[PDB]
Each structure stands twice: as structure tokens, then as C-alpha cells.
């Protein structure tokens, strides 16, 4: 994995030795080359993971997250170069450096063979993200957004450090390859109960769990667009990746300890989706939709059946692409009306027809339209939770009603109806913006032709 870490590192001289006008072009070009190179991680086998070294490996779980991670960086650089056009050159290079450093931490968060190196990169992803949100955010509440984002995360993860060092001292190694073969059954005790909670609550925070989700609608709406894209697309999926690694060790206690965290998810995806029926802010609606979609991934990991893991990893990749596109579309309106209010600018299919087609496709992939990988992940989670308990289909099916009822409402409020009369700075769609929407949607649609590369280690 050292053929991906060193090009990402070499993007630091590439953004700091460039001309004052070429720093977006060079970083976009070479990060697109790194994203093209990311497809060599598809050397996956039906029995063995792709094990590079003592430090780095990549199974079929980490590989789609890595391809999505290395693909998201040129897209964040395309989204972020408009609102940072008046920016100082040094601060512009600092923003590009924080995105590069965040990519560098993510691509060896997902490949960390050993779990405390996973912890160090997993908690190292805070600091560039914190700096991006609290420095290049727009409003007053970006500082409170950074405080909530930092102190839910570290409150969840500082027990995780102690739990991982306990596993290091007890088992002898936090190598995930050794812990596949030295895993012992975790019995029923209070020590093992708080062992389970210390292993899980960090990822429950970063997914987010319902009830712990309160950092997210502050951290998504107060971030800039590259921050919103990286929290939606990747930084929620650190929790899912970490759960799918750490629930190996947490058996058979999970089979009676996951009950409060499934209910909180199965009712919470009803609540947050319901919140999306009444959100006046468009970016907050996309944030609460992200909570609603990651609650299904929480249920699918906690029931730990194979169909559930396959649906959860397909749902993570699909939701990453879809929610990143939704934040980019909301940014496309915010760069024209300079307010995130969803009822402000209406009727925008008369004014931006092709951008309304991109809104339509992103709204259809939000509501899980088949055969998209959104519906593949949604459907497989619903199948495995029907296997879990037959009554859950109620809480599933009702959610699939409400997920439609805000996916099209967002389509009808922003793009349909009579347009706002007193708004006249509605420019035609830039080629940068349509390129950004197409680079989100066209991989999301091509992955319907071959979904087997985004279905985890147990396809």
C-alpha cells in the first residue's frame, strides 16, 4: 500500500511547488491519476485478503472504501475551487494540504492491518477535518460544530484506546490477521459488557448512532463543501469499517448486547427520516438523511449475518456517492442564492434544466431506485433483518415510504413549482458543476453493471 501513500504524500510538494494559478489543475490531475491507480486493489481472492506487508493489507471491505476515498479527492478539489477563488494563495495551498493529508490518513486507516494503527489513523482524521470545518466554514456556528464533532468523537474513542490496549495485552497482538485465528469467545460478564461498549461506542458515534447523532447536522452544514463531501462520503464509514473489524472479537456477547443499539437504529431511522420531512435547511435535510441511511448499516453490522454485511458495505459505498452528490447540488444552489434555505429558491427546473436532471437522478438514488447499488444495499439489509425478526419489515417498509417522501419533496421544493420572482442571479450551470455531478453519478450508475466489487469480504 506504499504505492498509494507515497503519491498522496508527493501531492504535498505538488501543491506547494506549483504556480499560483496551476494549483487546482495539478492536484486535480495527479489525484485523478492516483484514483486511476486505486483500481489495482481489486486483486481480491475468494479465500485470502490482499496482504501487502506487516503493516498494510486490503480485503474486499477496505478496497471499495479506498477506491471511493481516492476518487473523492479530485471531486472535493473541483467543488472547493469556486468559493476559494478570492482566497490567499497560502491559505489555498493550506486547504489543499488539509484535503491531501486527510486522504493520506484515510487510505492507511482502511488498510491498517493492526488495530492500534487503525486507531491512530482513525483519530488522526479529526485534525485536518477539524481545521477544514472550523477554518474554511462559512457561518458563526462552525466553531461549535468543530467542538461537537471533536468531543463526541474523542468521548467515544478514548475508551476504544483502552479496550484495544487490553486486547493487545491479553491476546498478544492487535493484528487483524492473527485475531482471525486467535479469537476467543467473549463470555457474559460485566467486564465483557463494558469491553463491548468500549469497542463499539466510538464507531457508534462516528456512524452516527441515533441519540449520538447530534454532532452531524452541525458538522455537515457548517463545513465547506469539501468537508461536507468527506464527512458524508468517507468519514461516516470509518465507523462501519471499524465495527466490521471489531465485531470479530465481540462474540457471542453481541447476540445479546446489540439489542439496545438496534432499537435506537430501527426507530432512529424512522425519526431522522421524519426530520427530513420538515427541514427548512437543505444541507440539514441531507445531513439527517445521512443519519437515516447509516442507521441501516448499524443494524446490518449488529445482526452480523453475511447478507447484512454485503448490504451494509454496498449501502456505505452507494450512500457515499449519493450523499456527496446531494451536498454538491445543495452547494450549487448556495453559490447562487447565498442561503441554504430550501424554500428560498424554487422552480429551478425552468432555470437550470440539466442541473434539475442531476437533482432528479440524485433524488432517485436517494430513494433507492433499482437496480442502483443504493437499492442493492437497502434491499439486502432489509432481507437480513427480515431474517432477524419478521416484524422489522414494518420499520423497514415505513422508512422506505418516508425516504421517498423527502427525496422527492426536496426535488419538488427546490426544482419544481413557480420560481422565485425576486431572485435573478441564477446563473446557468458551469461546466465545473455539471462535471462534478457527472463524476458523482456516472460511477454510481456504472456500479449497477458490476456490483460484486462493492459487496465486501464475503461475496
Amino acid at each position: 500500500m506504499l504505492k498509494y501513500i507515497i503519491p498522496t504524500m508527493m501531492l504535498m510538494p505538488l501543491t506547494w511547488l506549483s504556480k499560483n494559478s496551476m494549483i487546482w489543475i495539478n492536484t486535480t490531475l495527479h489525484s485523478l491519476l492516483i484514483s486511476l491507480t486505486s483500481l489495482l486493489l481489486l486483486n481480491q481472492f475468494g479465500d485470502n485478503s490482499l496482504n501487502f506487508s506487516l503493516t498494510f493489507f486490503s480485503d474486499s471491505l477496505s478496497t471499495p472504501l479506498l477506491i471511493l476515498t481516492m476518487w473523492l479527492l479530485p471531486l472535493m478539489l473541483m467543488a472547493s475551487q469556486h468559493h476559494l477563488s478570492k482566497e490567499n494563495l497560502a491559505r489555498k495551498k493550506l486547504f489543499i494540504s488539509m484535503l491531501i493529508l486527510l486522504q493520506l490518513f484515510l487510505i492507511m486507516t482502511f488498510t491498517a492491518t493492526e488495530l492500534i494503527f487503525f486507531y491512530i489513523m482513525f483519530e488522526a482524521t479529526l485534525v485536518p477535518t477539524l481545521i477544514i470545518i472550523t477554518r474554511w466554514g462559512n457561518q458563526t456556528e462552525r466553531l461549535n460544530a468543530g467542538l461537537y464533532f471533536l468531543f463526541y468523537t474523542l468521548a467515544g474513542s478514548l475508551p476504544l484506546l483502552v479496550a484495544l490496549i487490553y486486547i493487545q495485552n491479553t491476546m498478544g497482538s492487535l493484528n487483524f490477521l492473527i485475531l482471525q485465528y486467535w479469537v476467543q469467545p467473549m463470555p457474559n460478564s460485566w467486564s465483557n459488557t463494558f469491553m463491548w461498549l468500549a469497542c463499539m461506542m466510538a464507531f457508534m458515534v462516528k456512524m452516527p448512532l441515533y441519540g449520538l447523532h447530534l454532532w452531524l447536522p452541525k458538522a455537515h452544514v457548517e463545513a465547506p463543501i469539501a468537508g461536507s463531501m468527506v464527512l458524508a462520503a468517507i468519514l461516516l464509514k470509518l465507523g462501519g469499517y471499524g465495527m466490521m473489524r471489531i465485531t470479530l472479537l465481540l462474540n457471542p456477547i453481541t447476540d445479546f448486547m446489540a439489542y439496545p443499539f438496534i432499537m435506537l437504529s430501527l426507530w432512529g431511522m424512522i425519526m431522522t427520516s421524519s426530520i427530513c420531512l420538515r427541514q427548512t435547511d437543505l444541507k440539514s435535510l441531507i445531513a439527517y438523511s445521512s443519519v437515516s441511511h447509516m442507521a441501516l448499516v448499524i443494524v446490518a453490522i449488529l445482526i452480523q449475518t453475511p447478507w447484512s454485511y454485503m448490504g451494509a458495505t454496498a449501502l456505505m459505498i452507494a450512500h457515499g456517492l449519493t450523499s456527496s452528490m446531494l451536498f454538491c447540488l445543495a452547494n450549487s444552489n448556495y453559490e447562487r442564492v447565498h442561503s441554504r434555505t430550501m424554500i428560498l429558491a424554487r422552480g429551478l427546473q425552468t432555470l437550470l434544466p440539466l442541473m434539475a436532471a442531476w437533482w432528479l437522478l440524485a433524488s432517485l438514488t436517494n430513494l433507492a431506485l433499482p437496480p442502483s447499488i443504493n437499492l442493492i444495499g437497502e434491499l439486502f439489509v432489509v432481507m437480513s433483518t427480515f431474517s432477524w425478526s419478521n416484524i422489522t419489515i414494518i420499520l423497514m417498509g415505513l422508512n422506505m415510504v418516508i425516504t421517498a417522501l423527502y427525496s422527492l419533496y426536496m426535488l419538488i421544493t427546490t426544482q419544481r413549482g413557480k420560481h422565485t420572482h425576486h431572485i435573478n442571479n441564477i446563473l446557468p450551470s458551469f461546466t465545473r458543476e455539471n462535471a462534478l455531478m457527472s463524476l458523482h453519478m456516472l460511477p454510481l450508475l456504472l456500479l449497477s453493471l458490476n456490483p460484486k466489487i462493492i459487496l465486501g469480504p464475503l461475496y
Binding site: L54, T55, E114, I116, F117, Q168, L174
Partner: protein, 171 residues
């Protein structure tokens, strides 16, 4: 612990040297000359045994040899010695320097009638060798077995197995 083992009262009875300190200090140099051998056997036994209970008999030899020192003064030179310890006995600090004429008379009468040379300045502070037949005490501190020390380090120092082994550092 154990019973302390003391000698009886009959074991300690000996004919004491019942003279005053000025009588002793007046005869001190000739006592250090003539009564050398049992005194040094006793003080050697006293620093080697480190226990007075194992030094009584030699000590009795001291109390045997001092009295024969004084009787040999009493048989021959009782009156110049009597004047000399009286003159020593007058002073508070008991100065030898205030009594040099009685010292000269006592030393002359002793050297004539008994043939004793007074030790010079420096002789009585010498460290002398003592020929005894008593055994050397093999454990005068009544000590016991010292504990076994920890084993030392040996063997050639090989490198560390797989480096530091600190969570993920492969060196």
C-alpha cells in the same frame, strides 16, 4: 530469642588493682614497658573476640601482671614512687610536666634497683605483634549465611527479536 549467657559472680572474682588513677598514671610508662605481653594478648583477644565474656581469663592475666608490677615497686622503690604519685596527684589535669624532679628520682631509683628503662617519646603507641596459641575466631560477628546473589549476565548480545515489538513498529 535466646537466653543471654553471662558468667557467674564467682567467675568474675579477681584480686583488683586497688590503687588510684594518679598511682596508675605515675607508673604508666613502666607499666607499658614491663607488663607488655599479657596486656597485648588481652587487647588482641578483646578486638578479635569482640565479646568480653570470651576475654575474662586473659583479663585475669592482666590483673595478675599489674599487681606483680606494683609489689616489685613496693619491695624496692616504694618511697620515691610515693613522692612521685603524690606530686602527680596534686595537680588537676595531673601534669607530667609539673613533676619532673620526682620523675627523675623515680626513674633513677628504678633503673638502679630494678633495671627498667622508661619508654621514650613514641614507643608506647607502636603497633606490636603478639604470639598467641588461641585460635583465630572464624566468625566473631556470629553472622550467618549471606544470601545467594542474582545471576550475572552472560552470552553474546544478539539483536532484538523482530525489533521493538511496540504495537506495530517493525523496527
Amino acid at each position: 530469642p535466646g537466653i543471654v549467657e553471662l558468667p557467674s559472680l564467682e567467675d568474675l572474682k579477681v584480686q583488683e588493682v586497688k590503687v588510684s588513677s594518679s598511682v596508675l598514671k605515675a607508673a604508666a610508662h613502666h607499666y607499658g614497658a614491663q607488663c607488655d605481653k599479657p596486656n597485648k594478648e588481652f587487647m588482641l583477644c578483646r578486638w578479635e573476640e569482640k565479646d568480653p565474656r570470651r576475654c575474662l581469663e586473659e583479663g585475669k592475666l592482666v590483673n595478675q601482671c599489674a599487681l606483680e608490677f606494683f609489689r616489685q615497686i613496693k619491695r624496692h622503690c616504694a618511697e620515691p614512687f610515693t613522692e612521685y604519685w603524690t606530686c602527680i596527684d596534686y595537680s588537676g589535669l595531673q601534669l607530667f610536666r609539673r613533676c619532673r624532679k620526682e620523675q627523675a628520682q623515680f626513674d633513677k631509683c628504678v633503673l638502679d634497683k630494678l633495671g627498667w628503662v622508661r619508654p621514650d617519646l613514641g614507643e608506647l603507641s607502636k603497633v606490636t605483634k603478639v604470639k598467641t596459641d588461641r585460635p583465630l575466631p572464624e566468625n566473631p560477628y556470629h553472622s550467618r549465611a549471606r544470601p545467594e546473589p542474582n545471576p550475572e549476565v552472560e552470552g553474546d548480545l544478539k539483536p532484538a527479536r523482530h525489533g521493538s515489538r511496540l504495537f506495530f513498529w517493525t523496527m
